[PDB]
Each structure stands twice: as structure tokens, then as C-alpha cells.
Design a protein around this ligand. Sequence first.
Ligand SMILES: N[C@@H](CCC(=O)O)C(=O)O
Ligand SMILES: N[C@@H](CCC(=O)O)C(=O)O
Ligand SMILES: [Cl-]
Ligand code: NA
Ligand code: NA
Ligand code: NA
Lengths: 256, 255
Amino acid sequence: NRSLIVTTILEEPYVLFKKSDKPLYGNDRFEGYCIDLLRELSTHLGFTYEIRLVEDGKYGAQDDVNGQWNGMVRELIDHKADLAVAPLAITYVREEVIDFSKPFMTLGISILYRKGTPIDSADDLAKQTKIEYGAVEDGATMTFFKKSKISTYDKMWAFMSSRRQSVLVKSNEEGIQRVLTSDYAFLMESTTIEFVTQRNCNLTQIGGLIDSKGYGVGTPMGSPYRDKITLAILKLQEEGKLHMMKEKWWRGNGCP
Amino acid sequence: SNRSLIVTTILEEPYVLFKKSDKPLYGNDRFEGYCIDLLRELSTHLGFTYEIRLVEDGKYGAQDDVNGQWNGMVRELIDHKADLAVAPLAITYVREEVIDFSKPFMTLGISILYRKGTPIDSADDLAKQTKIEYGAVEDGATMTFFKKSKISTYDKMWAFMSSRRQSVLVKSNEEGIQRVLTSDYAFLMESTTIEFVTQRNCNLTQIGGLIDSKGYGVGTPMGSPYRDKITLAILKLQEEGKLHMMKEKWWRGGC
Ligand SMILES: N[C@@H](CCC(=O)O)C(=O)O
Ligand SMILES: N[C@@H](CCC(=O)O)C(=O)O
Ligand SMILES: [Cl-]
Ligand code: NA
Ligand code: NA
Ligand code: NA
């Protein structure tokens, strides 16, 4: 049968290009948690697939003026991909336009910053401007702040929006580099913060989780794959396989 | 006017309780708790009226392996005896095969409730001994997790629970807590419930971490159009901070 087209995005340790000396081709180019997940889904559901990086490099947000979506969300809306297998947050505005499986991982927005400071919460950032802060442009964290009616988060959005050319970044990688090279705190998903702080011993999570959400496999609205992938995810979780996959991709040396 | 939806639920503090009062209470007015607040929010967002009915057999729901029949709130949905189940109802593979669920409104896992002051640190420590008995709610998701598990520790625990089931499987979380307090017994319990119980009884503790991960969702019959509408409403409530506020309201109180 026809191979499914799977849109994804580079994001360690979910999706990475494998390191090698020989050139790699096709699906063999990729590894990571989400790649292992895709392989398990493919064997459980009995499909073959072709992995394609989303061409615009975005997760997906709606443009407030013209109403168009971008990123992996737009690929699904336009039926250019059958699945999005990535650390793609299940959100209200996305669920209105695409379908998602039930979550394979649960997480929330938090703060990545340097250690040793009196900053302990989002409120501490919101009430000042000397320490800049931001988020990935056109992702779920940005959209959370843009939409929020909560005073602290609305204030933070006004700051980020004013300073967006400097403080909104194109990837988590760029946000980490800003934390490491300037006085800057990055609003980042907690699963990713866990990965980063175990490898950057001068960095830490500040405060707890600001919200709660899951990552799910995206499908076009109405796809028959959505409910089948939910069932496969529930089976992999119950059997302990998702936990093993998390340990594989997050485990490492650590910090004193 | 549209037919009111029949909502099946189960008594379980602080999700669903009878209100305390001296005058008698009637109809929906009898009930309070996190899930009742959730139901009220869903009804205003989606535009329905409802009648709350406690599940007749007092069970969450499991399948009988001899005759294939389900029980509990799961069976009420399969048979279209309820439109919705709004309860701490775990989303599980075996249930998702037969009913539909919204996306989760809370995330949790199985853990262990026991008395303080013990070297027992995990399910592995329990499984390797038989002096301390252990069990779970009969015909709920925790029992079914053990019954289905191929993981050696958990399959050893199921063998023990099954052997001793008339004594160690209980009808409700409340009966499990009473067994922990009145005998040498550890209860396999969902973590959000452990959090509630241990903040109010300072002689009790959680043992170990979470053995698994799952969510609670609103149940619907398979194919219901309410499932995806309720998912959207839950996502909106989460993002606005209302689910967090509801958790704080119903779990607030310390040791
Ligand atoms: N995982 C996010 C991108 C990263 C973020 O927004 O923090 C998304 O699905 O949009
Ligand atoms: N919440 C459970 C019942 C309690 C338990 O199994 O621990 C269920 O949905 O079956
Ligand atoms: Cl769903
Ligand atoms: Na990328
Ligand atoms: Na949807
Ligand atoms: Na289902």
C-alpha cells in the first residue's frame, strides 16, 4: 500500500539527523524519540512511511491578519502530509483545524535560565526588563502568551511582542544559545528543559509548570489514523515502551 | 427544549461527593466536587442540560474474561444508558476499544498508599514478599493494569491479588484506605487520590513513584459527537487556567 507522508521538524532529542561519515538517504537519515515512536506505530498499524522535514521550519500558528496557518499544522490542513510525528503540542486552536492522537507525553511551559539568581517565577520576570525573555516564534508557547488573559502572562506578551525581533527565536536551539550568551530567560517546554539542564550544568528550570499540555501525533481533520494511533500509543504506554524510549533519549551523564 | 443528557458518575472524594446539609437535597443539587464543577463548565460551554445518575452497579468498569461482558460506567456507555461519564475515569487501551474518551483533564499514575515508617520503597519490594498484603479496587483500571501486565513484578503481584482477591480487592478507594489503616496492607491507588488522602491523614504516605502514566477523560459511547466537542472545551478550560483553579479548590487544605 501507499507510504504515509510524515512531516516532522528537527528538535533534539525528538528528531535529529544521525551522525555518520557515509551520506545517509531517506528515512535512514533520522533518529530520536519521535523516530522510534514512528517506527513502533508503523509496525503496530502496518504502514510504511516517508519522513519529510517541514519546509518552513515551523510548528504552526495562525496569522492574525490573513488567517493562514503555517508549519506542520498547515501541511496537515492542506493534506500534504498524512501524519505529523514531532513534539507537537495539542492545543485548542490547533484541535479546531487538525486532529490529534491522545498524548504520548505530558509537559508544560516553564523557564530556562542560569543558576544562582533570585529569579524564581514568571512573575519575577514580568515585573522587570533588565533580564530579557522570549520563546520560539510561531509555536505553542508563544501562542499561549499571545492569547492569555492572565495579568502576568499578558504583561510578558506585551514585552515579547515589543521586543520580538530580538527575543523571539526560530528554534529551541537558538533560545538556549541566547540563555548561554546573554542575560536572557527562555520560555520552553518542560520536557525539553529536562534534556537541556542535564547537559548544561550552569542552567536550570525556574519555577514550576505554567500550564499543562500533551504532545500528540497530528493528522488531517477526520483522518481514520487518529483513533488507531491513539490506541497504539495507549498500548505502548501501558507496556512500558514509552517510558523506555524516554529513558533512552533523555539518559546521560548529568550534573554534580 | 433539548433532552437532558444522562451523566453517569461514581462517589469518589474530591471528584464527586454528596453535599453535607441538614435539609434534604434533590436532583443535581445533591452533588459537589471537582467533576461536578467540570460538568457545570461543560454544560455552559456546549449548551446542554443534564441529569446526574450514580452508576447503578457502583463500578468503574472491566470486562469479564469468561462471558466478554463489561460492567460499571463503561457498560452504561456501551449500552447507551448514559450520554456521558464525568468521573475520575481512566483512559485505557481496553476501554478505548469499546467507548470513546475526551482528551485528558488530569494526568496521573498508579502508586502505593501505605503507613509511614517502613523500609518498603517500591512495588518490587512488595512483590517479593507476602507478609504485607496488597490490593486495588475491583473492576477498575488499576486492577486491570495488573491483570494484563507482562512485566514480571506486576504479573507476580497480580498472581497474589487474584489468589487473595476476596480479601485484597475492595469495592472503592475508601475501603482500600480503611484496609491500610486497620491491617498490614498496602493499596495500589491512583496518585491524585493518594495526594488527597495523605494530606489529610498524616499517618499515611505514598511509597515509590508512579508505576504508569494515564489520564482521566470524559467517557462517551463509541461514535458520540460529544467526544470531540468536550475535548475542545477541556483544552480551553486548561489554557484559561480553570482546571488548575478547580484542582486547587478541591485539593486545598497539610501535614
Ligand atoms: N512544541 C511547540 C514548539 C516549542 C514551543 O512552543 O515551546 C509546538 O508544538 O508549537
Ligand atoms: N479511576 C479508576 C478506579 C480506581 C483505580 O482503579 O485505582 C478507573 O477509572 O477504573
Ligand atoms: Cl481523542
Ligand atoms: Na528545527
Ligand atoms: Na480536531
Ligand atoms: Na474509543
